[PDB]
Design a protein around this ligand. Structure first.
Ligand SMILES: CO/N=C(\C(=O)N[C@@H]1C(=O)N2C(C(=O)O)=C(CSc3nc(=O)c(=O)[nH]n3C)CS[C@H]12)c1csc(N)n1
Length: 265
Protein backbone atom coordinates (compact mmCIF):
# COMPACT_ATOMS: atom_id res chain seq x y z
CA UNK A 1 0.00 0.00 0.00
CA UNK A 2 3.11 2.19 0.10
CA UNK A 3 2.58 3.33 -3.50
CA UNK A 4 -1.09 4.17 -2.84
CA UNK A 5 -0.11 6.30 0.16
CA UNK A 6 2.79 8.09 -1.54
CA UNK A 7 0.71 9.06 -4.58
CA UNK A 8 -1.98 10.44 -2.26
CA UNK A 9 0.69 12.70 -0.76
CA UNK A 10 1.47 13.96 -4.27
CA UNK A 11 -2.25 14.46 -4.98
CA UNK A 12 -2.84 16.37 -1.73
CA UNK A 13 0.28 18.58 -1.84
CA UNK A 14 0.51 19.11 -5.64
CA UNK A 15 4.11 17.95 -5.92
CA UNK A 16 6.35 15.09 -7.01
CA UNK A 17 7.59 12.93 -4.13
CA UNK A 18 10.67 10.72 -4.26
CA UNK A 19 11.77 8.42 -1.43
CA UNK A 20 14.36 5.68 -1.05
CA UNK A 21 15.24 3.49 1.93
CA UNK A 22 18.18 1.10 1.44
CA UNK A 23 17.40 -2.51 2.24
CA UNK A 24 18.78 -4.18 5.36
CA UNK A 25 19.00 -7.73 6.67
CA UNK A 26 15.54 -7.14 8.16
CA UNK A 27 13.80 -4.41 6.15
CA UNK A 28 13.17 -4.35 2.41
CA UNK A 29 13.77 -1.54 -0.10
CA UNK A 30 11.21 1.23 0.37
CA UNK A 31 11.32 3.10 -2.94
CA UNK A 32 9.00 5.68 -4.50
CA UNK A 33 10.31 7.40 -7.64
CA UNK A 34 13.77 6.79 -6.19
CA UNK A 35 15.55 6.83 -9.58
CA UNK A 36 14.32 10.20 -10.83
CA UNK A 37 16.38 13.37 -10.60
CA UNK A 38 15.75 16.07 -8.00
CA UNK A 39 17.76 19.16 -7.24
CA UNK A 40 20.54 18.82 -4.68
CA UNK A 41 19.75 22.17 -3.11
CA UNK A 42 21.46 22.33 0.27
CA UNK A 43 21.62 18.52 0.60
CA UNK A 44 24.99 18.56 -1.20
CA UNK A 45 26.62 20.34 1.76
CA UNK A 46 26.68 17.10 3.77
CA UNK A 47 28.79 15.09 1.26
CA UNK A 48 30.78 18.26 0.53
CA UNK A 49 31.84 18.48 4.19
CA UNK A 50 32.88 14.83 4.04
CA UNK A 51 34.79 15.65 0.85
CA UNK A 52 36.82 18.22 2.78
CA UNK A 53 37.35 15.67 5.56
CA UNK A 54 38.55 12.87 3.28
CA UNK A 55 40.99 15.01 1.27
CA UNK A 56 42.55 16.69 4.32
CA UNK A 57 43.83 15.79 7.80
CA UNK A 58 42.20 16.98 11.00
CA UNK A 59 44.77 19.79 11.21
CA UNK A 60 43.19 21.33 8.09
CA UNK A 61 39.89 22.04 9.89
CA UNK A 62 41.70 24.83 11.79
CA UNK A 63 42.92 26.75 8.73
CA UNK A 64 41.78 30.38 8.70
CA UNK A 65 40.01 31.33 5.46
CA UNK A 66 39.61 35.06 4.80
CA UNK A 67 36.50 36.04 2.83
CA UNK A 68 34.66 39.31 2.26
CA UNK A 69 31.07 40.50 2.50
CA UNK A 70 31.02 40.63 -1.31
CA UNK A 71 31.54 36.85 -1.19
CA UNK A 72 28.09 36.66 0.48
CA UNK A 73 25.80 36.01 -2.49
CA UNK A 74 23.54 33.43 -0.83
CA UNK A 75 21.48 32.84 2.30
CA UNK A 76 24.36 32.45 4.76
CA UNK A 77 23.32 32.93 8.40
CA UNK A 78 26.64 32.02 10.05
CA UNK A 79 29.16 33.56 7.64
CA UNK A 80 27.34 36.90 8.01
CA UNK A 81 28.84 37.52 11.47
CA UNK A 82 32.43 36.45 10.70
CA UNK A 83 33.11 38.78 7.77
CA UNK A 84 36.40 40.01 9.26
CA UNK A 85 37.17 37.11 11.62
CA UNK A 86 37.35 34.67 8.76
CA UNK A 87 36.38 31.17 9.81
CA UNK A 88 38.22 27.89 10.17
CA UNK A 89 37.32 24.99 7.88
CA UNK A 90 35.81 23.14 10.84
CA UNK A 91 33.56 26.13 11.47
CA UNK A 92 32.37 26.34 7.86
CA UNK A 93 31.70 22.60 7.93
CA UNK A 94 29.54 23.43 10.95
CA UNK A 95 27.82 26.29 9.13
CA UNK A 96 27.23 24.45 5.85
CA UNK A 97 25.63 21.47 7.62
CA UNK A 98 23.95 22.80 10.76
CA UNK A 99 22.78 26.13 9.29
CA UNK A 100 23.15 25.49 5.51
CA UNK A 101 25.37 28.56 5.11
CA UNK A 102 25.60 29.31 1.40
CA UNK A 103 28.92 31.16 1.57
CA UNK A 104 30.35 28.31 3.66
CA UNK A 105 29.70 25.76 0.90
CA UNK A 106 31.06 28.12 -1.77
CA UNK A 107 34.44 28.49 -0.09
CA UNK A 108 34.17 24.82 0.83
CA UNK A 109 34.08 24.15 -2.92
CA UNK A 110 37.10 26.45 -3.32
CA UNK A 111 39.17 24.50 -0.77
CA UNK A 112 38.37 21.30 -2.71
CA UNK A 113 38.83 22.14 -6.39
CA UNK A 114 40.16 25.69 -6.41
CA UNK A 115 38.54 28.89 -7.66
CA UNK A 116 36.85 27.21 -10.63
CA UNK A 117 37.05 23.46 -10.11
CA UNK A 118 35.00 23.07 -6.95
CA UNK A 119 31.76 21.69 -8.38
CA UNK A 120 33.66 19.24 -10.59
CA UNK A 121 35.71 18.05 -7.61
CA UNK A 122 32.66 17.57 -5.38
CA UNK A 123 31.08 15.56 -8.19
CA UNK A 124 34.29 13.55 -8.52
CA UNK A 125 34.23 12.70 -4.82
CA UNK A 126 30.70 11.32 -5.23
CA UNK A 127 32.09 9.16 -8.03
CA UNK A 128 34.67 7.88 -5.53
CA UNK A 129 31.74 6.66 -3.40
CA UNK A 130 30.28 4.83 -6.42
CA UNK A 131 27.74 7.57 -7.21
CA UNK A 132 27.89 8.01 -10.99
CA UNK A 133 24.42 9.59 -11.22
CA UNK A 134 24.64 12.76 -9.12
CA UNK A 135 26.22 15.90 -10.54
CA UNK A 136 26.99 19.37 -9.21
CA UNK A 137 27.53 22.01 -11.89
CA UNK A 138 26.70 25.32 -10.19
CA UNK A 139 27.67 27.02 -6.94
CA UNK A 140 25.45 29.02 -4.64
CA UNK A 141 23.15 30.79 -5.41
CA UNK A 142 22.51 29.16 -8.79
CA UNK A 143 22.39 25.46 -7.84
CA UNK A 144 18.88 26.00 -6.41
CA UNK A 145 17.49 27.75 -9.51
CA UNK A 146 17.82 25.18 -12.30
CA UNK A 147 14.64 24.68 -14.38
CA UNK A 148 12.55 21.53 -13.93
CA UNK A 149 13.71 18.54 -15.94
CA UNK A 150 17.27 19.90 -16.06
CA UNK A 151 19.84 17.30 -15.03
CA UNK A 152 22.32 19.83 -13.65
CA UNK A 153 22.82 20.08 -9.87
CA UNK A 154 20.69 16.96 -9.43
CA UNK A 155 20.90 13.63 -7.65
CA UNK A 156 18.40 10.85 -7.04
CA UNK A 157 16.96 9.57 -3.75
CA UNK A 158 18.64 6.25 -4.58
CA UNK A 159 21.98 7.96 -5.21
CA UNK A 160 22.15 10.33 -2.24
CA UNK A 161 20.76 7.74 0.19
CA UNK A 162 23.41 5.26 -0.93
CA UNK A 163 26.08 7.95 -0.47
CA UNK A 164 24.93 8.82 3.05
CA UNK A 165 24.84 5.12 3.93
CA UNK A 166 28.58 5.08 3.20
CA UNK A 167 29.16 8.36 5.07
CA UNK A 168 27.35 7.48 8.32
CA UNK A 169 27.14 3.68 8.25
CA UNK A 170 29.90 2.76 5.79
CA UNK A 171 33.70 2.92 5.85
CA UNK A 172 34.23 5.81 3.44
CA UNK A 173 35.15 8.17 6.28
CA UNK A 174 37.58 7.03 9.02
CA UNK A 175 36.22 6.67 12.59
CA UNK A 176 37.19 10.06 14.04
CA UNK A 177 36.27 11.93 10.86
CA UNK A 178 33.00 9.99 10.73
CA UNK A 179 32.29 11.02 14.33
CA UNK A 180 32.35 14.75 13.56
CA UNK A 181 30.22 14.35 10.42
CA UNK A 182 27.67 12.36 12.43
CA UNK A 183 27.76 15.04 15.13
CA UNK A 184 27.33 17.93 12.68
CA UNK A 185 24.07 16.83 11.05
CA UNK A 186 22.74 15.57 14.40
CA UNK A 187 23.05 19.18 15.61
CA UNK A 188 21.29 20.56 12.52
CA UNK A 189 18.78 23.33 13.19
CA UNK A 190 17.02 23.23 9.80
CA UNK A 191 15.21 19.87 9.65
CA UNK A 192 12.96 19.84 12.71
CA UNK A 193 9.70 19.84 10.72
CA UNK A 194 10.82 17.34 8.06
CA UNK A 195 11.96 13.76 8.65
CA UNK A 196 12.27 14.35 12.41
CA UNK A 197 8.62 15.46 12.49
CA UNK A 198 7.72 12.09 10.95
CA UNK A 199 9.61 9.76 13.25
CA UNK A 200 8.72 9.30 16.95
CA UNK A 201 10.70 10.81 19.83
CA UNK A 202 12.62 7.73 20.97
CA UNK A 203 13.80 7.30 17.37
CA UNK A 204 17.15 8.99 16.75
CA UNK A 205 17.37 11.20 13.65
CA UNK A 206 20.30 12.85 11.84
CA UNK A 207 19.62 14.88 8.72
CA UNK A 208 20.64 17.60 6.26
CA UNK A 209 17.96 19.65 4.52
CA UNK A 210 17.62 21.18 1.08
CA UNK A 211 15.18 23.87 -0.07
CA UNK A 212 15.03 25.85 -3.27
CA UNK A 213 13.06 27.33 -6.13
CA UNK A 214 10.15 25.56 -7.84
CA UNK A 215 8.93 24.33 -4.46
CA UNK A 216 12.00 22.19 -3.78
CA UNK A 217 12.35 20.80 -0.25
CA UNK A 218 14.64 17.87 0.55
CA UNK A 219 15.99 16.16 3.66
CA UNK A 220 18.54 13.33 3.49
CA UNK A 221 18.73 11.45 6.77
CA UNK A 222 19.82 8.38 8.71
CA UNK A 223 17.31 7.30 11.36
CA UNK A 224 17.99 5.11 14.39
CA UNK A 225 15.36 3.09 16.24
CA UNK A 226 15.25 2.20 19.96
CA UNK A 227 16.69 -1.28 19.36
CA UNK A 228 19.48 0.35 17.34
CA UNK A 229 18.79 -0.88 13.79
CA UNK A 230 19.97 1.92 11.46
CA UNK A 231 18.03 3.09 8.42
CA UNK A 232 18.83 5.68 5.76
CA UNK A 233 15.91 7.81 4.56
CA UNK A 234 15.95 10.18 1.57
CA UNK A 235 12.83 12.30 1.04
CA UNK A 236 13.07 14.67 -1.93
CA UNK A 237 10.19 16.51 -3.58
CA UNK A 238 9.35 19.54 -5.69
CA UNK A 239 6.32 21.45 -6.96
CA UNK A 240 7.48 22.29 -10.49
CA UNK A 241 4.04 23.11 -11.90
CA UNK A 242 3.66 26.28 -9.86
CA UNK A 243 6.51 28.54 -10.96
CA UNK A 244 9.87 29.40 -9.47
CA UNK A 245 8.14 30.90 -6.41
CA UNK A 246 6.03 27.81 -5.69
CA UNK A 247 5.88 27.37 -1.93
CA UNK A 248 7.71 24.30 -0.59
CA UNK A 249 5.69 22.07 1.74
CA UNK A 250 7.69 20.98 4.78
CA UNK A 251 4.72 18.90 5.95
CA UNK A 252 5.17 16.80 2.79
CA UNK A 253 8.48 15.32 3.93
CA UNK A 254 7.10 14.79 7.44
CA UNK A 255 4.16 12.83 6.03
CA UNK A 256 6.46 10.72 3.86
CA UNK A 257 8.61 10.10 6.95
CA UNK A 258 5.53 8.96 8.88
CA UNK A 259 4.83 6.37 6.17
CA UNK A 260 8.34 4.91 6.29
CA UNK A 261 8.10 4.78 10.09
CA UNK A 262 4.92 2.70 9.70
CA UNK A 263 6.80 -0.02 7.78
CA UNK A 264 9.80 0.05 10.16
CA UNK A 265 7.92 -1.07 13.30
C1 LIG B 1 19.65 30.95 -3.81
O1 LIG B 1 19.31 30.11 -2.72
N1 LIG B 1 18.10 29.93 -2.47
C2 LIG B 1 17.71 29.25 -1.49
C3 LIG B 1 18.71 28.62 -0.61
O2 LIG B 1 19.61 29.29 -0.14
N2 LIG B 1 18.58 27.33 -0.35
C4 LIG B 1 19.18 26.64 0.79
C5 LIG B 1 18.60 25.37 1.29
O3 LIG B 1 18.39 24.27 0.81
N3 LIG B 1 18.43 25.98 2.45
C6 LIG B 1 17.76 25.60 3.53
C7 LIG B 1 17.94 24.24 4.03
O4 LIG B 1 18.80 24.03 4.91
O5 LIG B 1 17.22 23.33 3.56
C8 LIG B 1 16.89 26.47 4.07
C9 LIG B 1 15.59 25.96 4.63
S1 LIG B 1 15.61 25.80 6.39
C10 LIG B 1 14.93 27.10 7.25
N4 LIG B 1 15.69 27.71 8.19
C11 LIG B 1 15.22 28.74 8.92
O6 LIG B 1 15.95 29.28 9.78
C12 LIG B 1 13.93 29.21 8.73
O7 LIG B 1 13.50 30.16 9.41
N5 LIG B 1 13.14 28.64 7.82
N6 LIG B 1 13.61 27.56 7.05
C13 LIG B 1 12.70 26.97 6.06
C14 LIG B 1 17.20 27.95 4.10
S2 LIG B 1 17.86 28.44 2.53
C15 LIG B 1 19.11 27.25 2.19
C16 LIG B 1 16.25 29.08 -1.26
C17 LIG B 1 15.70 28.50 -0.10
S3 LIG B 1 13.97 28.50 -0.26
C18 LIG B 1 14.06 29.24 -1.82
N7 LIG B 1 12.97 29.54 -2.57
N8 LIG B 1 15.33 29.48 -2.20
Amino acid sequence: DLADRFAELERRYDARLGVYVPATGTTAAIEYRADERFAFCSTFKAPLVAAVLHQNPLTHLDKLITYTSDDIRSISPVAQQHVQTGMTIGQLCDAAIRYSDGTAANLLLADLGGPGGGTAAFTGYLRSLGDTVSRLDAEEPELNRDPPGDERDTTTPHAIALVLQQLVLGNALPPDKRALLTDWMARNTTGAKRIRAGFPADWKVIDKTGTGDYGRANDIAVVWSPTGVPYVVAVMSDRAGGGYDAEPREALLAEAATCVAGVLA
